[PDB]
Amino acid sequence: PKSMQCKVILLDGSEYTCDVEKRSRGQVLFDKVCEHLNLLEKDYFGLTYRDAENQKNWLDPAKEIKKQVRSGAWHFSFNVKFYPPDPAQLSEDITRYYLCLQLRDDIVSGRLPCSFVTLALLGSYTVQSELGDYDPDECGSDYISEFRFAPNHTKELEDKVIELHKSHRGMTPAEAEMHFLENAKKLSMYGVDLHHAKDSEGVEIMLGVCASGLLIYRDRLRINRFAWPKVLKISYKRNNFYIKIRPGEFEQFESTIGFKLPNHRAAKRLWKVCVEHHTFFRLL
Ligand SMILES: CN1CCN(C(=O)Nc2ccc(F)cc2)CC1
């Protein structure tokens, strides 16, 4: 029974390797990775792979791995797929831990923009969780953490992490990880999956997919929002993506809104993540 080697980049940056039968569905690999991670609250997570265009795609757990990775390597990342709006409602501390690891990469990568002060506060909770109580012996006036806190590190930011770390004496890792999440969850781009697009006029916009709905960023001023309940149908056709809005009160007709994506693959990818978010966040 022929098996393919799988390599999975974990959220701590280490690599998990296993074998699966070459006709295996994504769920088989996902279950192995989650068992490795001692993760029970699996519904928030997924595996990603890179397609022939180097775009990130979710591995569909219901479909054969081979039919998704096609010509590419059996190389994956383990990621948060659905960011919980209220991480305090998760059952297990270990779930919150993996969500913290993801958010730390979202911040360092610049996917999740963050003020100086919030970068320093999030850093201070990570330091408290991972080293415990502040110790002056380790950190002199010239201290620079090994910890990556931001897309760009400054001495000022390092100083502020240390100043806030001092305030967290007695804080336990789950407690510090919960404070991390109570701050991160409020950030305007928390759990927003962004897609480059053009409006029905050719104006370059961003489409954001998240728990609360579909966001349209037409620049720093003029952000439109479509809550998931207000969306009856998501469709794609060639390079175009469409949302069918419920009729407003006393309105005769549904309304359909159309966008232009980079290519057909990008339209199908945006369609699939919207359908998935709509289904996931509808239920809980
Ligand atoms: C396999 N499904 C996954 C979706 N669904 C669920 O509970 N979603 C959810 C929404 C929002 C939240 F914050 C947590 C979970 C039930 C089982």
Swiss-Prot record:
The lineage of its organism: Eukaryota, Metazoa, Chordata, Craniata, Vertebrata. Tumor suppressor that inhibits cell proliferation and promotes apoptosis. Modulates the activity of protein arginine N-methyltransferases, including PRMT3 and PRMT5. The chain holds residues 107 to 390 of 1087 of the full protein. Residues 4-284 form the FERM domain. It comes from Homo sapiens. This is Band 4.1-like protein 3. Interacts (via FERM domain) with CADM1. Interacts (via FERM domain) with PRMT3; the interaction is direct and inhibits the protein-arginine N-methyltransferase activity of PRMT3. Interacts with PRMT5. Interacts with PRMT6. Coiled coil: none annotated. It is found in: Cytoplasm, Cytoskeleton; Cell junction; Cell membrane; Cytoplasm. Expressed at high levels in brain, with lower levels in kidney, intestine, and testis. Detected in lung.
